[PDB]
With several copies, the nearest count.
Chain A
């Protein structure tokens, strides 16, 4: 059974493929303070990686 990853986190992971850990991408889903949220690729990759380690 796959450990749960939210749809927004999935989008951000997709957006960060073939890119550097320091690179920043736009969110596909999130707006805060009148602007599309920016995400660092290192953070989303890491969060996904700790979920693949907890998956069967």
Chain B
């Protein structure tokens, strides 16, 4: 029994918690994980796009084949020797890593804060014996190149042109079953009460599926642009985005910088908001006083950590830490998504608010934490109200057929996309007056500036929902929307007067 995995996961897998072996649990998780119906492969719009060269690393299970050269047949030791100058830093980083130094983990003492790693090593060994990859009286010697890139605990020679693979989530999960299962449990825990988002979303478990099931991503001709989106959406496929290859350091993944590359930018500025907040500035100032090697559960005591971080806040749930990051989500970044605001006062959201309060009250008083979280909720709605007034104007114009070029120069989006108003497609594709300026402006008002307003509120950066992001930029959009609206009415009336003189 992996006690950190929810009942819903075992139930969805048709497994008994107590009876299931590591082999059985792994096999069931992988069966779902690799099923096209459950999100794997090219997805529903696969006939519209082809992989590019980098795609073999982004989705290895669908696209990866080993290189035609070098034509080599190598032992475990040969991988290291040859790559020591072929890809030198990979060898050096690996040699530095825990994966290459398992004996040091066995020698750990019970009074070491890092002792938990010895228990985890034995857990991995227990998993592997169950899978038949390790002998009952055989210790795992190391986790080397050939283990991840060919087969776990391989004893013989590998063909470089035939046997080499890119380690995917299921590869890591062969040993790290707990973490793989916890991550996969996002499919089962992230279920919205009214289907505000698709079941299991948003999550890391289905980030790549979300990406390839986005219409413009599949429809747009600019493949190299689309694949930038893919690079932020690979957690589904590979486990090296927070703790990177080839050091695979847990301490690294605990640092706020590990999340920054993806959780940043114009429609979700989490890195920007967090680091500018007091929380994040303290994290910058105190990073050398904190013991990052300590597990998240020990961070606030044995680690000396006195300010919250992405991982500590988002991986915490009801006093425990898992690779499941979905269970406290209420707003889900984009406050305008139908049903989200309306759901904010439900028992479901309230229970998730309670769970957040527990996170905050490790430091703040409950009265303090609830006071600010109330400000966050109401400030988000206040932003939403502002956008809704502006959208009422522009959406009316669309339905009235009065947007610039709407009947004159609005070519259809690329297949299989269908035409519409203020659609996600119009951010990554445009032609003629599709979209119109007003249309893009009100779209970005919600997509970018309202989203960033909420992020600013959620991550405690005053400027990030007032002057600089959120209210400031939304104020301008509102002003310019109203201005263009009035100008276009005035011009429409002037056109009507010229029509009269002609009639």
Contacts and interface: CB of A to CB of B under 8 A. Distances in A.
- Establish whether A and B are touching in the complex (CB under 8 Å): yes
Interface of A: 1-8, 10-11, 13-14, 17, 26-37, 51, 55-56
Interface in B405-444: 411-415, 417, 429, 431
Across the A-B interface, give the 9 residue pairs with the lowest CB-CB distance, nearest first. A7-B384, A7-B385, A34-B412, A29-B385, A2-B342, A7-B381, A2-B339, A31-B414, A8-B385
Interface in B359-415: 377-378, 381-382, 384-386, 388, 411-415
A36 B338 CA distance: 27
A30 B223 CA distance: 12
Contacts of A37: 221
B344 A10 contact: yes
Given A29-B385, A30-B221, A36-B414, 13 more contacts: A5-B341, A7-B381, A7-B382, A7-B384, A7-B388, A10-B345, A14-B377, A29-B222, A31-B221, A33-B412, A34-B413, A55-B194, A56-B194
B225 to A, nearest CB: 9
Interface string B470-485: 0000000000000000
B195 interface: yes
Contacts of B386: 29
A28 B382 CA distance: 7
Interface of B: 50, 194-195, 221-224, 338-339, 341-345, 377-378, 381-382, 384-386, 388, 411-415, 417, 429, 431
A6 B391 CA distance: 12
A28 B222 contact: yes
Determine which residue in B223, B339, B417 has the highest number of CB atoms from chain A within 10 A of its CB, and name it: B339
Contacts of A8: 385, 388
A11 B378 CA distance: 7
A39 to B, nearest CB: 11
Contacts of B221: 26-31, 36-37
Contacts of A36: 221, 414-415
A30 to B, nearest CB: 7
A3 B382 contact: no
A28 B414 CA distance: 12
Contacts of A29: 221-222, 382, 385-386
Contacts of B412: 33-34
Given A2-B194, A33-B412, A34-B413, A28 B378 contact: yes
Contacts of B341: 5, 7, 10
Contacts of B388: 6-8
Given A2-B339, A11-B382, A33-B412, A28 B223 contact: yes
A50 to B, nearest CB: 13
Nearest to A11: B381
Nearest to A15: B378
Contacts of B195: 1
A26 B415 CA distance: 13
A28 B221 CA distance: 5
Nearest to A6: B388
Contact of A2 (B50, B222, B343): B343
Determine which residue in B195, B378, B417 has the highest number of CB atoms from chain A within 10 A of its CB, and name it: B378
A49 B94 CA distance: 48
Nearest to A51: B342
Nearest to B374: A14
A55 to B, nearest CB: 8
A6 B386 CA distance: 11
A26 B43 CA distance: 20
B342 A10 contact: yes
Determine which residue in A1, A10, A14, A56 has the highest number of CB atoms from chain B within 10 A of its CB, and name it: A10
Contacts of A3: 342
Given A2-B194, A11-B385, A28-B223, A35 B414 contact: yes
Nearest to A31: B414
A27 B223 CA distance: 10
Contacts of A32: 411
A13 B194 CA distance: 20
30 contacts: A1-B194, A1-B195, A1-B338, A1-B339, A5-B341, A6-B385, A6-B388, A7-B341, A7-B382, A7-B384, A7-B388, A10-B344, A17-B345, A28-B222, A28-B381, A28-B382, A29-B386, A31-B411, A31-B413, A31-B431, A33-B412, A34-B412, A34-B413, A34-B415, A34-B417, A35-B414, A36-B414, A37-B221, A51-B342, A56-B194
Nearest to A9: B385
Nearest to B392: A6
Contacts of A2: 194, 338-339, 342-343
A7 B341 CA distance: 7
Nearest to B418: A34
Contacts of A14: 345, 377-378, 381
B381 A35 contact: no
Contacts of B381: 7, 10-11, 14, 28
Contacts of B382: 7, 11, 28-29
A46 B344 CA distance: 18
